[PDB]
Design an enzyme around this catalytic site. Sequence first.
Site, PDB file in Angstrom:
ATOM      1  N   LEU A  70     -19.188 -84.255  71.232  1.00 14.23           N
ATOM      2  CA  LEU A  70     -17.384 -84.823  71.572  1.00 14.23           C
ATOM      3  C   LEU A  70     -17.113 -83.334  70.707  1.00 14.23           C
ATOM      4  O   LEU A  70     -16.874 -84.477  68.669  1.00 14.23           O
ATOM      5  CB  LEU A  70     -16.670 -85.974  71.806  1.00 14.23           C
ATOM      6  CG  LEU A  70     -17.046 -86.427  72.668  1.00 14.23           C
ATOM      7  CD1 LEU A  70     -15.593 -87.445  73.200  1.00 14.23           C
ATOM      8  CD2 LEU A  70     -16.934 -85.722  74.762  1.00 14.23           C
ATOM      9  N   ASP A  71     -16.198 -82.756  70.381  1.00 18.69           N
ATOM     10  CA  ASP A  71     -15.330 -82.142  69.432  1.00 18.69           C
ATOM     11  C   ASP A  71     -14.064 -83.082  69.104  1.00 18.69           C
ATOM     12  O   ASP A  71     -13.833 -84.054  69.487  1.00 18.69           O
ATOM     13  CB  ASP A  71     -13.947 -81.213  70.364  1.00 18.69           C
ATOM     14  CG  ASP A  71     -14.328 -80.356  69.271  1.00 18.69           C
ATOM     15  OD1 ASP A  71     -14.169 -80.008  67.688  1.00 18.69           O
ATOM     16  OD2 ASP A  71     -13.976 -78.745  69.651  1.00 18.69           O
ATOM     17  N   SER A  72     -12.992 -82.412  68.588  1.00 17.05           N
ATOM     18  CA  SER A  72     -11.928 -83.471  68.023  1.00 17.05           C
ATOM     19  C   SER A  72     -10.536 -83.386  68.875  1.00 17.05           C
ATOM     20  O   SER A  72     -10.136 -84.247  69.271  1.00 17.05           O
ATOM     21  CB  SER A  72     -11.129 -83.170  65.698  1.00 17.05           C
ATOM     22  OG  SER A  72     -12.715 -82.964  65.368  1.00 17.05           O
ATOM     23  N   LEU A  73     -10.403 -81.841  70.431  1.00 18.19           N
ATOM     24  CA  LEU A  73      -9.427 -81.800  70.791  1.00 18.19           C
ATOM     25  C   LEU A  73     -10.553 -82.814  72.432  1.00 18.19           C
ATOM     26  O   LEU A  73      -9.415 -82.946  72.650  1.00 18.19           O
ATOM     27  CB  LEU A  73      -9.457 -81.101  71.296  1.00 18.19           C
ATOM     28  CG  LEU A  73      -9.386 -79.581  69.878  1.00 18.19           C
ATOM     29  CD1 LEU A  73      -9.158 -78.236  70.628  1.00 18.19           C
ATOM     30  CD2 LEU A  73      -8.139 -80.452  69.069  1.00 18.19           C
ATOM     31  N   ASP A  74     -11.349 -83.542  72.019  1.00 17.28           N
ATOM     32  CA  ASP A  74     -12.215 -83.707  73.182  1.00 17.28           C
ATOM     33  C   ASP A  74     -12.122 -85.128  73.572  1.00 17.28           C
ATOM     34  O   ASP A  74     -11.580 -85.419  74.415  1.00 17.28           O
ATOM     35  CB  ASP A  74     -13.807 -83.546  73.118  1.00 17.28           C
ATOM     36  CG  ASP A  74     -14.319 -82.182  73.608  1.00 17.28           C
ATOM     37  OD1 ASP A  74     -13.835 -81.903  74.536  1.00 17.28           O
ATOM     38  OD2 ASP A  74     -15.251 -82.197  73.323  1.00 17.28           O
TER      39      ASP A  74
END
Lengths: 96, 133, 144, 81, 48, 446, 49, 59, 48, 84, 110, 111
Positions: free
Chosen positions: J38-42
């Site tokens: 997962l991304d930081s924005l996810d």
Amino acid sequence: TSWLGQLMLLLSGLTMFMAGLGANFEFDLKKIIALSTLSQLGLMMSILSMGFLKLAMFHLLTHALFKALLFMCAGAIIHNMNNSQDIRLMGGLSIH
Amino acid sequence: AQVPLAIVSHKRQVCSLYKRALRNLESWYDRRNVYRYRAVQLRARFDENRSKDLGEGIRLLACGQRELFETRHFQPRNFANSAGGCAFEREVIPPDWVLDYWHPLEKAQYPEYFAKREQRKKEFVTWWEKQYG
Amino acid sequence: GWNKDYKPGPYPQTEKERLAAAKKYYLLPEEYKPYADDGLGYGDYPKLGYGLGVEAKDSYYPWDYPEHKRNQHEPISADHDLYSEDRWSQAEPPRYSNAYYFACFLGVMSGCLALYYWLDDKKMYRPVAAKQYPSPGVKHYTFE
Amino acid sequence: PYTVPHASTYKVESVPQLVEVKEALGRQGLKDPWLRNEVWRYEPKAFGTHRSRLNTFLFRGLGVGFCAFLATVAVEYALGI
Amino acid sequence: VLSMMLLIISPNLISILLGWDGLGLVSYCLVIYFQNIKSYNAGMLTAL
Amino acid sequence: MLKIIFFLLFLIPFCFINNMYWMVQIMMFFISFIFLLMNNFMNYWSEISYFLGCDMLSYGLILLSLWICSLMLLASEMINKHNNYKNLFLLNIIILLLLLILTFSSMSLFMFYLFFESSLIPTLFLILGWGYQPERLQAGLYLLFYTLLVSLPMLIGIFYVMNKIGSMNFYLMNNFMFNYDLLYFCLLCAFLVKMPMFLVHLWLPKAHVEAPVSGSMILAGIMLKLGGYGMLRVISFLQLMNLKYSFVWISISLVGGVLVSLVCLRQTDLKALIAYSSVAHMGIVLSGLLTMTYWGLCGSYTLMIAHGLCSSGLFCLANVSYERLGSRSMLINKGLLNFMPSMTLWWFLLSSANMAAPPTLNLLGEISLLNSIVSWSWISMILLSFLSFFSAAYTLYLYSFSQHGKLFSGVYSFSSGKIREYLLMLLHWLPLNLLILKSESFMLWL
Amino acid sequence: MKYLSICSISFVNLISMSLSCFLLSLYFLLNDMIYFIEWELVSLNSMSI
Amino acid sequence: VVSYRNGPPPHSKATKIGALTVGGAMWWWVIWHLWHEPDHITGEFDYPNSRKWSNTELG
Amino acid sequence: IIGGSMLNWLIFPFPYMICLPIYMKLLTLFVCIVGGLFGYLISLSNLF
Amino acid sequence: PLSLKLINERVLLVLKLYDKIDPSKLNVESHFINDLGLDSLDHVEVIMAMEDEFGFEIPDSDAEKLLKPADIIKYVADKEDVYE
Amino acid sequence: SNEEQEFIKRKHEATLKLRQEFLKQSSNPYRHATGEGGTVFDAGLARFQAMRVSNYEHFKPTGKSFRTGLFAVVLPIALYAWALKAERDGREEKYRTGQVAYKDRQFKFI
Amino acid sequence: MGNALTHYMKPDVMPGPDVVPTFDPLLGFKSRKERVMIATQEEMESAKLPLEFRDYCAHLAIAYQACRSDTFPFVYKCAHQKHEYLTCEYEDYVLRMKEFERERRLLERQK
């Protein structure tokens, strides 16, 4: 027939225009209905600034009836939507 | 009991900007499909831009903060039960020690509840002596 | 334990008095900042945040006192009444300046008063005469 | 939250209003993971459509009102006329 | 509602002031019936 | 009269008997009932006994004095629970009430002066004896030195009036008229300090705070009205010169009412805010007194009567939160609707009485006072609207911030409300709405 | 008020008062009749509050 | 009641009967006053043209 | 529902007489029609 | 009236409606960064999904202090005051 | 800056110690069980109280204080007194000269 | 715009609002009839008619008040008689709608 009546007529029509534009741009249910109250106040104060007591009284009684009815409707809808007065969250209440 | 620390990272800053930008986008676009389309557009705008350096990221973060301040809705959508909502903290619960100041005839209406409270008082005073005593 | 015991003292001319006043008010030395040396200005009391009110402060932080948004032994600001949550505070900073709001309101008001009072003697009227009322001295006629 | 469903019930292709957004994002070259969270929001059985709700709302008692109006007309001609 | 009838049936300016003050005070109290700072600010505005 | 005076003189030995604290207030309410019975008074002096007589202004002020002292013994149960000196407290209260009855039923100016400046010594004794603050010395010295400094040359003015006229009686001195600046300043400035001005007030917010509850009752209930009674007796023979010099005092009082009403919005003490609230209403009283109309004098008498009850009732309300929450600070006093909900009825009923209220005598005093001041000049309509708007801008702040909102965290357990306190704030508000019935009594003293 | 709803008490009381006031208002429209009762409080300078 | 990702619980007969009853009451009132008094929506009295009158009668 | 015709026969002992042309009597009805057709379909939102 | 099993069903339903998370790899103890990609924005999208699902607002410190679905269950059950 | 994080960490440690003191003193069962009401001893509340009461000790007659005391208090008093005296003198010369009729004078108290 | 706007453009052509007949009433040589009141002053003031409703046919308003007081509160039973009073006002309005109009013709013949 007074400058008081002329000024009151202008300010009453101006709060009609204010209330119509504000309730067209308002995104809260009970604030829309309070702006509708403002629009009807502008209607009654401008017709008494014309000088018609019976017209103002008839619209006063009529507005009291349908506006207590609208606020009771809004309270039931808010009480079932759990205190969310935002009109964006509400939707499709005709079926429910 | 972890008290939050006041230092905010740059990734935490851009995550907060992303959250506030999508909350403003949800406030502006009321329909869920249009909000979803614009949210994917804003996510692509963030995802084309995450490969830069740190100083350029800081300057463009300040530019994004200025842009989000410029496009902020006049009536932002907020949850009613949370803080800052339309109906936050509508009732205030007084502390329970006023229940200890009832009349004994008024205390006789809930005698099992007051007996359980008097039982719990000894457990609380031993717990307080264990914790802070 | 009275007002004569805990009170603001003389102004910290030297640095050691500033450090002692910072340690007295349960504030780190870097945070402490006294007032000016003018006649109105307080002596030895810290100058807290005058940027924006209590609503700007974080409501999600666990406070010792959730009301007033402050912890224990934290120095209360001198204008705590004016910068309270009740009066003259905003949760977010305002979008525009202070003069733009009043400027737009009195601009719309001046335009509406001007355009109304210019047209005060151009009221319309139906193709209708004056309302004839019966008088014992003046008589009126029909058209038949 | 009584009798919650599984994720296999919610499908994007059942509704038109979300596959239009999916087709627009595929034309733009983007994908979206939260379409399956909003499949329940547009249901033709539980929630209906826009045209059925307008006919339910504007004309809720038009047939009953027209039947009562015919009854009032029929009882008025027997007495008034 | 009682203060509202005391305003309606009065032609005297002093008694309209009686019903006026009654309407303002009980309207402020019923606005601040809910216990939060939003109702506080609303009551202060509708009282002034 | 002599019945009330000899009643208090023979109620003096009640103090020396042990466990006799509650019988004295019973006999005080009984003599208040007897004084309610003896009400055959008109605008002239009646029940003439030696040098003691009574007219309608004196009747209302003695009845207010008896009611305030009878409630003053009811409010001070903290003196009775502790072993603080109950006999000395009762003796000081009886002596002070006797001096107030003697200075209000005085037929002449000099006996009024003598018992008027005898009254400040028991107030001094209550402030420095039964208060709960380290600054009681700053409280009593400001009061005594302010009133003494401006009231000593009033004695020179009083004997100058005696040497020019011959008599001391109010009626024979009503016939004469003087055209001197310094006589006017001597006979006015002592009362101009005794009721609060803007410039000379200082003794008031620094003597109400550091006193006891009983000092607060006796100061904001009847000893801001000694100056009003004195000006109502002195202004009758100084009309020409006060018409020359009254615009300065009326302008200072009106701007000071607006400014002190702006002070109370920046006050963090309950007992200090009512102390400054006494300045704003008595500013309207002072502004309506110097216009010399029938309506100004009648509305001034009505507003002093209706203010001595409501300010004292507000000072009892700040005491019953100081006894429990431990401090008079406005930040601590928050959300008392969830602590004492039955008290909140009396908070709003006595805070509304401080402003214009529908059934109270304060509105009938405020209406008849604004009539005279708008009649005096049209420029006063700008600043009477600001003052009467700011009055409820600040007076709603004390009820709103003390009785609504979130609760103050970190408060220890205190006792609940009592029937004595509910009775104490019952008798501070039901006289305010039972006296609009038979209001020609408490208004037409002329 | 005990063993009963204060809202129901107020509801029945105000329907009875509203019906009485409505039936009084219909009688005052048949005659075009205005009543004005006056209760004196205090009289001074020929002016009566 | 509470509902999750679905409609409400099915409504009682009384609510549906009342909804159709008040809709029928409103529309019966509207169509009844339309039939008995159609003249109120339009001009109740005729508005003749002021340029239609002859000048030979007064002029 | 009934408070329109219940009070129009009661608050008016002498009714007002209206003689207006065809473009002014139904003018408020036409404005209500274009406001109903305007205030609904503008709030309808589509993509792009 | 809620329950821990119901709130657990809410959390796994919202996290399995996410197309960037494989439901085979999904678990109550699965970490959002190390175990799942997962991304930081996810994670912000997951946090606002829980905000729109559960109907409150999660602060940023409480957004970054949640790394597991069981942590989200413990955070929701503490806020809405259910333990059985 | 690295100096900012150490300052914030030291302030957080001081806030944690004061918070632990508040949680120890606020839920004290013995102090609650004494029955005498009161509050937890906060230093900043007493500092605020003595700040609001005592203010003459930091006062000096400077030019800024003189400007504030002139333009805040004395100047509206002087302007209001001048306006009231001018209006009353202008009405009083018309009253004493006789330019107004008996039945055409405002505020007859009738 | 309209009737006010021409009053800004051609004031000498279009007469003012609520204008009285400036010229002679017998200038058109109709020898037109005189409106004669049926109800006189004492029964006009007996029925408490307001001063804005004391028109040339107040007897129809008096009969409408009588029929309203005859079947009160159900005053719709002679509702058509209300229209009778209304059409008298309409007839008066028609007279007013002529009394302006020929005046404009009388202001056109001199122009």
